[PDB]
Ligand binder design. Structure first.
Ligand SMILES: CC(=O)N[C@H](CCc1ccccc1)C(=O)O
Ligand code: NA
Length: 330
């Protein structure tokens, strides 16, 4: 089997991407944030505290003939941005882009933090990291991908995120029309439960490539590119008037600037992030300080190849027994 679903930016900055997901019988379609940095499929629901719902579509298990309470199971998750959610668990039928899993754990939110409430466009998350990170207790649950894996034509999914445009998540096949040149595969560690790999270095604009190992995660659920402070300082040093602002909490730059590209290495291959991908717009409405898309990881504890980096590539998440990542230009 395979599946193929379009993923759409939630706003004009590509802050996140939503993908429609069918849950239950008859189908209830919710728009979920597919997150390769977490392992819970959770949704706004008929159980979510009413004051914490503001415009989201909710899953109502009582209206699904295939929903079953997973008795005694609870979940609670905290993300890198400080947001959180928690609740109880149902099993139900979940379909993405024509690919169906029966008995998927659908984590129903009783509580969500303010950042989720305030984002009316995201109805929940679909985690695509390794199932070792799943937060369901006392019986950990599998991701949609791990449940689908044995049924797929090939044990893979691909992320093809758009720049200010829709893109695609495919499951079970690699669309050879969706990328240029060849795909370069690189090793993954699952030791922390993430799609963790080591980039071979970077370049700023038309500068020389610096060969240096940068260990980080491929995370579709993070907007920006978070790299070591040395690398980030070298990038922003090429933008007149750019500075790190502890008031704003990152590098900002004059909105009048033209940004240089940023290249990262995947083995001997190179992925180029155009400068425009690194512009996240005025910090507050009407400001001429713009927020940067490359930020320091020094206050995180891990480097994160978020959407700024991933949307410059066609990315293969290869979940064979020995997982790998692949990157192609597009
Ligand atoms: C150095 C690099 O970019 N790739 C190699 C092979 C990665 C690999 C492993 C198994 C099957 C296909 C590919 C590596 O990271 O060890
Ligand atoms: Na922000």
């Amino acid at each position: 089997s395979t599946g193929s679903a379009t993923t759409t930016p939630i706003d004009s900055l590509d802050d996140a991407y939503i993908t429609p997901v069918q849950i239950g019988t008859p189908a209830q379609t919710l728009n979920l944030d597919f997150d390769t940095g977490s392992s819970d499929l959770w949704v706004f629901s008929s159980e979510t505290t009413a004051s914490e719902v503001d415009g989201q579509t909710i899953y109502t298990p009582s209206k699904s003939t295939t929903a079953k309470l997973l008795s005694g199971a609870t979940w609670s998750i905290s993300y890198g941005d400080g947001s959180s959610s928690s609740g109880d668990v149902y099993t139900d039928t979940v379909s993405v882009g024509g690919l169906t899993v029966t008995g998927q754990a659908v984590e129903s939110a009783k509580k969500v933090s303010s950042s989720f409430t305030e984002d009316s466009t995201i109805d929940g998350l679909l985690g695509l990291a390794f199932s070792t990170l799943n937060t369901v207790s006392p019986t950990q649950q599998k991701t949609f991908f791990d449940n689908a894996k044995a049924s797929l034509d090939s044990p893979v999914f691909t992320a093809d995120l758009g720049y200010h445009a829709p893109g695609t998540y495919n499951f079970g096949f690699i669309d050879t029309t969706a990328y240029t040149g060849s795909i370069t595969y690189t090793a993954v560690s699952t030791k922390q439960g993430f799609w963790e790999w080591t980039s071979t270095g970077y370049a700023v604009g038309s500068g020389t490539f610096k060969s240096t190992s940068i260990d980080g995660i491929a995370d579709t659920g993070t907007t920006l590119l978070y790299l070591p402070a040395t690398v980030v300082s070298a990038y922003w040093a090429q933008v007149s008037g750019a500075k790190s602002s502890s008031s704003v909490g990152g590098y900002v730059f004059p909105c009048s600037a033209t940004l240089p590209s940023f290249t990262f290495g995947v083995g001997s291959a190179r992925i180029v992030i155009p400068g425009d991908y690194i512009d996240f717009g005025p910090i507050s409405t009407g400001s001429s300080s713009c927020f940067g898309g490359i930020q320091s990881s020094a206050g995180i504890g891990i480097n994160i190849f978020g959407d700024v980096a991933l949307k410059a590539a066609f990315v293969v998440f290869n979940g064979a027994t020995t997982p790998t990542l692949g990157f192609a230009s597009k």
